[PDB]
RNA sequence: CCGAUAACGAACGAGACUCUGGCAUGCUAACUAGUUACGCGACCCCCGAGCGGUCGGCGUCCCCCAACUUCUUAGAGGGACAAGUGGCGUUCAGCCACCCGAGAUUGAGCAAUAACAGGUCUGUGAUGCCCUUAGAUGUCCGGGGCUGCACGCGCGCUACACUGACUGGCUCAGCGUGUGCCUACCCUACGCCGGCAGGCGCGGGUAACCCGUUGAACCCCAUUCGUGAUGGGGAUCGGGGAUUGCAAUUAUUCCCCAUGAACGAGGAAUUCCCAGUAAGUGCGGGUCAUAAGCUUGCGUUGAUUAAGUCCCUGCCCUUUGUACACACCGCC
């Protein structure tokens, strides 16, 4: 535990790690992208809203300082 | 068809914040300072406004037009007064221009929902006294 | 089915209103909008850009809750927290050249009027206006 | 000396401006209401002008 | 006138300020002047807060000292004149009276 | 927009003598030269016409080098006049934004003419001890021991 | 309205003249045997009532000490003229008096009376006056040089809650 | 039908020991619509027993000197939390959050004064009422500490500090300390 | 806790009982509304307590022979 | 308090008392508070509503040209008493729980005998004695000092951050003050100039009439930030601009632009507190020509825990021991 070094901006190695299994677990929000991606975390959120844009990501709440996000329904 | 005169004004409080709700023969609406009962600033409240609605059904409350006027307190003093201004309202009217039949039940749903929906909440403040920054708390004293 | 502005959230409806009068873009805009700071107590000029039709938008709203209103009372909605740093702290109140170009710009728009005492308030066209609004934002909240 | 020095320091303000009208004390005055009265005068006096306890 | 006009009676205590508003009212029935009624105005409560000692030693108890100031007021209306009519005040130490018309 | 780390993305940039950290935002990376603030650096993105949403690595030649003017000289491109640090210098009285170990040498300057003037103010600079007034009895006292 | 002050300091003013009168009265009447002052204000005129055990004394010869009394509270407080009239009134019950009853009992004290028999003497006077009690407390440097207290108390005597304001008079 | 936050019916909420079930107040008696209303239930003594658990899961929440009025905000944390649980787990968040207080209220302690034999001198079982408050407090403080100083919020971390202790994983700082107290009396038996 | 009355009310309850044991009743209204004619009472709190306690006093002496 | 009882009869203190908060759709009263209704209007819907919705827009004590007091105000009154029920109790004094109730323990003020070598002679034209009294220890004027800094301690404020900071929008108070005997110095609406601090004219208010519907903060809703001594913190320090004053340097205060120092929750120790309480949060008064990190009050948000004990620190009553009585900080 001594520093975080996160990426500030995405790149080939982090874009599709991004893209090919964000949408497919259960809780999405920027927090836990940011922890599980070593990114900042503004990317994070806009990373986010580019995936909700693009319509592969449900978001549930859409609060100012908690928002939260989920994969689509299978079936 | 057309009887007029059928109007009840009945106040409720909570930590000095007023709101005397104007209910009256009509078509049924609730309004707080010309807003929507539904759109109010503090809206994690809104189940607190909506909660005697909710209770009693919009059966009971489509046959009158209610204004309700709010001139004190904080924000949810505000809204805690409204619920209960509405609430006590909604008995005074059914509890003089239709049966107490009625007025029994649905005060009793009121009651053992919440009782501070018809009962107003008496505490309200505490004066501070010349020892401490408050009424009860004291300032750090120091031995050495 | 008429719609006023107490029927609708006033938080988008002032956004709506901003849009508004950006598209329609006829305002006495100052020379420092670039600048200054809106108020002595903030310590950042504001993020967005064309924030100026959006102050003018909130006046505005503000005009039509209650009329006669100066500058000095519009610094007081406009007042906010100041920290003092190390000190503790206090309320502060708005720009007073921003409230009174704002109302200035209001004028040149020529939806707000002084009153036969002091302070200004909306004209009916202005009311119109915010009503028509309020109206269509009503409209696109509900479908 | 002469008129030109002996009171020409200003005292048009200041806590040397106001003193006690009871006693001419210059500390604890209370210029509330117009008392003008020192800090210990108004406790001798407060039954006399009427300022009674209550709690 | 064709004359109205207002008195207004302030004082600290409301027994005596209770005996004029009363005495002064019913001295107006029996003299047949219609009373616009008694607005009794909002309390003036004056408050001083001093310490106690006058040494700075000690355990920093502060006395609280307050002043009830309370007003009235009563508007004698008549279609006749009034201030010929009425010249009585019967007022007692304590309390006091102030008289206007409706162009002050 | 949310796209890859661009090819030319220098981490650290080379702003007139000191380095400024590419990976924040622009609106507060070039805060960390000295002479330059939050408002500043706001004010001249303004009127440099930069999009104030993107980080200062990813920024070109050509905006750097539009920003680079500004800061030198904000009296030309508007910046108002109570705006600037060395506003009616005591040297040559004229209005001045200083930018870098210029104001290293400015502070040095005026400190060492307060001295040769031997001012209150100069020889409390001289001693360590404070100069606006305050009560040295009680604080500062890291500073010394 | 302008010239007149508001309602506050007039009667903060009202309070501060009675204190300034009754300070007055009980520095110049101290020997007549002075209890009290009670002033009744009109926007006509003013009457200055003095309660006080000797009318005799405190009216010099003809009215001449009563006449200077009024002629200094006119000219003190700046009344117009002819608008302040001072009467002097015999209080009832003297001995219920405790303004009086300290006042002769420092006469006394002054005169060169034994402390004692002086207290005695003024604690079975209150009480032949009749009152449901008494209590006299005598403080300072009494016999050598270390300061000492003497209270002499006889019947009925509360001290604690309101009552004690219109039954207990203090001096 | 009552639909705490708009949703998360109370009716399907079981208790699964009947020793708390006394103090648990998600029944229907006690289901309300939102979890904010000043019922002063600390003026008598076993009056918290009746307020809802929700109620006292957000008064507990607000702590630090930051937060000892920010009722809404805490209101708006469990919301947020409730709605992560139900994302993340399928079942009733307040299904979740009585499983979790049942499995955090630490059976038994140890409480004494004089000369402590590990920490106090008798080992002593606990009551239902201090289960509950042992629970919630220990719940709400490893949220705390969870959300203290890292980029996941208190929604997040009274999440799953909730979902941990739900089903129990010695990963939640409620179980753990729970563990603690649980060996510190079993040592002083 | 701290109800306990006090020989002012409880020697002007026994005395008023003794004096006008025919007007008194077991109401507790009825009571406090005797009192004010059959004596003076400063204060409606004194009152209202004293007439209490003659409630109480008057119970006790209809099941049995109080001192009184 | 009941009871016993060589005591009987009393007195103070406690209680009682006064103020305060909570209920009174019961009474009186209101153009310096309003509400309802109606009439002019202004805007939306006009598909068609139309006794539709909003208005802190104008009016109906402008005197005939509406009523009423629910809301506000303040007076007289009422109301709560362990009163009712169950249990415990010598079936007494009372205690526990419950119903009905606004309230079944609202906070203060006052507050005994006896004392302390406790503090004030720097509150007094309260004062004994002593000192000084014309080169004054009187008094006035100018300047400086009371701020001065290797250090230690006390009351506090700001923080250490994401339960957050910034930016914008929305939205709610109550105490209480306001133009002066000396005495000069009031609270301020509105308009204009300035980016801000401020300045310039027009007014209102001696006040439920004006500031003021006190558009307070926290909070709420969206934006940016992203775990870094970072957009946390704003100490230190430079330059510049105003305000008060006769005078601002040892910076009075305020404003603007730069510098971002320690500080990442704090050892041993230790303070305060039981419900609208602690705490967060602002706003009045006092001080004030200039001004609050202080203090005294007010309102807003609003809990965790506890209904117990004598373990620590103490207090009261009874018994007991004493070589103490300046009384265990004793004595020896
Ligand atoms: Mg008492
Ligand atoms: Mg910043």
């Known amino acids: ?75 | ?144 | 089915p008429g719609v006023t502005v107490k029927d609708v959230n006033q938080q988008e409806f002032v956004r709506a209103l901003a849009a508004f009068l950006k598209k329609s873009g006829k305002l006495k805009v100052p020379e420092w909008v670039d600048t200054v700071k809106l108020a002595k107590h903030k310590e950042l000029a504001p993020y967005d850009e064309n924030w100026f039709y959006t102050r003018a938008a909130s006046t505005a709203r503000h005009l039509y809750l209650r009329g006669g209103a100066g500058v000095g009372s519009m610094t007081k909605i406009y007042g906010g927290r100041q920290r003092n740093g190390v000190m503790p702290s206090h309320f502060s109140r708005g720009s007073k050249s921003v409230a009174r170009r704002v109302l200035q710009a209001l004028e040149g728009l020529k939806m707000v009027e002084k009153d036969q005492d002091g302070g200004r308030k909306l004209t009916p066209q202005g009311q119109r206006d915010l009503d028509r609004i309020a109206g269509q934002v009503a409209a696109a909240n509900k479908k | 000396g002469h008129q030109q020095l002996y009171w020409s320091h200003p005292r048009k303000f200041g806590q040397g401006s106001r003193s006690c009208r009871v006693c001419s004390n210059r500390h604890g005055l209370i210029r509330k209401y117009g008392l003008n009265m020192c800090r210990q005068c108004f406790r001798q006096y407060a039954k006399d002008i009427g300022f009674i306890k209550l709690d | ?104 | ?145 | 309205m302008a010239v007149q002050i508001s309602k506050k300091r007039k009667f903060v003013a009202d309070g501060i003249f009675k204190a300034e009168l009754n300070e007055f009265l009980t520095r110049e009447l101290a020997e007549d045997g002075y209890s009290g002052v009670e002033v009744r204000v009109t926007p006509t005129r003013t009457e200055i009532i003095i309660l006080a055990t000797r009318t005799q004394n405190v009216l010099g010869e003809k009215g001449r000490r009563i006449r200077e009394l009024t002629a200094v509270v006119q000219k003190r407080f700046g009344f117009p003229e002819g608008s302040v009239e001072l009467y002097a009134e015999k209080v009832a019950t003297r001995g219920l008096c405790a303004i009086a009853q300290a006042e002769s009992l420092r006469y006394k004290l002054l005169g060169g009376l034994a402390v004692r028999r002086a207290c005695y003497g003024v604690l079975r006077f209150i009480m032949e006056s009749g009152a449901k009690g008494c209590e006299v407390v005598v403080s300072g440097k009494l016999r050598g040089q270390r300061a000492k207290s003497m209270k002499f108390v006889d019947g009925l005597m509360i001290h604690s809650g309101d009552p004690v304001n219109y039954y207990v008079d203090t001096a | ?189 | 806790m701290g109800r306990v009355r006090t020989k002012t009310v409880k020697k002007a309850a026994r005395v008023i009982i003794e004096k006008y044991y025919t007007r008194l009743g077991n109401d507790f209204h009825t009571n406090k509304r005797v009192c004010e004619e059959i004596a003076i009472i400063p204060s409606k709190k004194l009152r209202n307590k004293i007439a209490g306690y003659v409630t109480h006093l008057m119970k006790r002496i209809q099941r049995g022979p109080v001192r009184g």
């Open chain 1, 1 to 75: 535990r001594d520093k975080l070094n996160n990426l500030v901006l995405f790149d080939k190695a982090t874009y599709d790690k991004l893209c090919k299994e964000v949408p497919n677990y259960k809780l999405i929000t920027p927090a836990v992208v940011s922890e599980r991606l070593k990114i900042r975390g503004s990317l994070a959120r806009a990373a986010l809203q580019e995936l909700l844009s693009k319509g592969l990501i449900k978001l549930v709440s859409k609060h100012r300082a908690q928002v939260i996000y989920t994969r689509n329904t299978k079936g």
């Open chain 8, 1 to 189: 039908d009552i639909k705490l936050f708009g949703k998360w019916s109370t009716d399907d909420v079981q208790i699964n020991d009947i020793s708390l079930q006394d103090y648990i107040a998600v029944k229907e008696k006690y289901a309300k619509y939102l979890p904010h209303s000043a019922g002063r239930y600390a003026a008598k003594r076993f009056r918290k027993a009746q307020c809802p658990i929700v109620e006292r899961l957000t008064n507990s929440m607000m702590m630090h000197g930051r937060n000892n009025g920010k009722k809404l905000m805490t209101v708006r944390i469990v919301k947020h939390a409730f709605e992560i649980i139900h994302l993340l787990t399928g079942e009733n968040p307040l299904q979740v959050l009585v499983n979790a207080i049942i499995n955090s209220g630490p059976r038994e302690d140890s409480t004494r004064i004089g000369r402590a034999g590990t920490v106090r001198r008798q080992a002593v079982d606990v009551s239902p009422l201090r289960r509950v408050n042992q629970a919630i407090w220990l719940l709400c403080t490893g949220a705390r500490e969870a959300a203290f100083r890292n980029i996941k919020t208190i929604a997040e971390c009274l999440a799953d500090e909730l979902i941990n202790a739900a089903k129990g994983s010695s990963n939640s700082y409620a179980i753990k300390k729970k563990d603690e107290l649980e060996r510190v009396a079993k040592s002083n038996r």
């Open chain 2, 1 to 144: 068809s057309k009887g007029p005169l059928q109007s009840v004004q009945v106040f409720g409080r909570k930590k000095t914040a007023t709101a005397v709700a104007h209910c009256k023969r009509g078509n049924g609406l609730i309004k707080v300072n010309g807003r929507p009962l539904e759109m109010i600033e503090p809206r994690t409240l809104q189940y607190k406004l909506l909660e005697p609605v909710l209770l009693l059904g919009k059966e009971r409350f489509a046959g009158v037009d209610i204004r309700v006027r709010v001139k004190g307190g904080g924000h949810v003093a505000q809204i805690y007064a409204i619920r209960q201004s509405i609430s006590k309202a909604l008995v005074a009217y059914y509890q003089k221009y239709v049966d107490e039949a009625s007025k029994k039940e649905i005060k009793d749903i009121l009651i053992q929902y919440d009782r501070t929906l018809l009962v107003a909440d008496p505490r309200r403040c505490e004066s501070k006294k010349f020892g401490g920054p408050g009424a009860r708390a004291r300032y750090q004293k120091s031995y050495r």
């Open chain 6, 1 to 145: 927009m949310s796209l890859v780390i661009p090819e030319k993305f220098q981490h650290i940039l080379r702003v007139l003598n000191t380095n400024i950290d590419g990976r924040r935002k622009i609106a507060f990376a070039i805060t960390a030269i000295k002479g330059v603030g939050r408002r500043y650096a706001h004010v001249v993105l303004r009127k440099a016409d930069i999009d104030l949403t993107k980080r200062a690595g990813e920024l070109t030649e050509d905006e750097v080098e539009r920003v680079i003017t500004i800061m030198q000289n904000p009296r030309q491109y508007k910046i108002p006049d109570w705006f600037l640090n060395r506003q009616k210098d005591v040297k040559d009285g004229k209005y001045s934004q200083v930018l870098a170990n210029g104001l290293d040498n400015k502070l040095r300057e005026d400190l060492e003419r307060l001295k040769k003037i031997r001012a209150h103010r100069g020889l409390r600079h001289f001693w360590g001890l404070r100069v606006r007034g305050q009560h040295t009895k009680t604080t500062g006292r890291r500073g010394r021991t």
């Open chain 5, 1 to 104: 006138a064709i004359h109205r006009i207002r008195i207004t009676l302030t004082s600290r205590n409301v027994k005596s300020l209770e005996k004029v508003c009363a005495d002064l009212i019913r001295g107006a029935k029996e003299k047949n002047l219609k009373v616009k009624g008694p607005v009794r105005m909002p309390t003036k409560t004056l408050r001083i807060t001093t310490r106690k000692t006058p040494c700075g030693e000690g355990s920093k108890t502060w006395d609280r000292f307050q002043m009830r100031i309370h007003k009235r007021l009563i508007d004698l209306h008549s279609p006749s004149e009034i201030v010929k009519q009425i010249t009585s005040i019967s007022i007692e130490p304590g309390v006091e009276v102030e008289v206007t018309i409706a162009d002050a």
